Specification:
Length: about 140
């Protein structure tokens, strides 16, 4: 009830400002605690950069450094069953993923780019910037 004019109910319809609970919907919905998509599957890091040059080794030391991998594997191509596409590195604990995505995802190194994406499904709250309104670049 923004304001009661004491004449009508609500002729004009406005949907932009809402002060009460905020936050559209809940985080990852409200499933029965554990139905399938468990949050413990955060340590699953999908690594990608090179195609036929994607080596679990380079990604092993490179990624395991910031987060020791428990189960590392590369996502090969089912077309020729050859090593390609991209790799995967499952960190020991989901707590390690935070460090991976924090300082390993898109890690634009001088000669390479460490693209790392979680395998889990969810946490689609943010949207990577998503356009911006000015900021700098005058002089």
């Amino acid at each position: 009830m923004s304001q009661i004019p004491l004449v009508s109910q609500y002729d004009p319809y406005g949907q932009t400002a809402q002060l009460q609970q905020l936050q559209q919907q809940q985080q990852q919905h409200i499933p029965p605690t554990q139905m399938n998509p468990e949050p413990d599957v955060l340590r699953n890091l999908m690594v990608n950069y090179i195609p036929t040059t994607v080596d679990e080794v380079q990604l092993r030391q490179l990624f395991e450094r910031y987060g020791p991998i428990e189960s590392v594997k590369i996502v090969c191509d089912r077309e020729t069953r050859q090593s390609r596409g991209y790799g995967f590195v499952k960190f020991q604990s989901g707590s390690s993923a935070q460090q991976a995505i924090a300082g390993l995802n898109g890690f634009n190194i001088l000669n390479k780019r460490l693209k790392v994406a979680l395998a889990a499904s969810g946490h689609q709250r943010p949207g990577i910037a998503g356009a911006v309104g000015d900021g700098n670049g005058y002089l």
